[PDB]
Amino acid sequence: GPEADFYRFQVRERKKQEINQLLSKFKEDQERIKVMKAKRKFNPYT
């Protein structure tokens, strides 16, 4: 619609603050987690 279209563009086109730091944190966790996992995320033997 014409309304949802405006709020949509204005929403994203605006900027990102909260989601910024949030995503950064998640990424950091993915970094450490990956290091902890070392190898692939699979079970060679179970």
Q: How far is CA 15 from the centre of its chain?
A: 16
Alpha-carbon distance of 28 to 20, in angstroms, equals 13
Ranges assigned E (strand) in 1-46: none
What are the phi and psi torsion angles at 43 (to 5°)?
-105, 105
Biggest distance spanned by C-alpha atoms of the chain? 56
Structural method: NMR
Alpha-carbon distance of 2 to 7, in angstroms, equals 9
Alpha-carbon distance of 12 to 19, in angstroms, equals 11
Residue found under tokens 């309304």: 3
Alpha-carbon distance of 6 to 1, in angstroms, equals 9
Question: Which pair of tokens denotes residue 44?
Answer: 């060679």
Q: What domains sit in the chain, N to C, each tagged with a CATH number?
A: 1-46 (6.10.250.1770)
Alpha-carbon distance of 42 to 22, in angstroms, equals 27
Measured CA to CA in angstroms, residue 39 lies from 1, 26, 28, 30, 33 at distances of 48, 20, 18, 14, 11
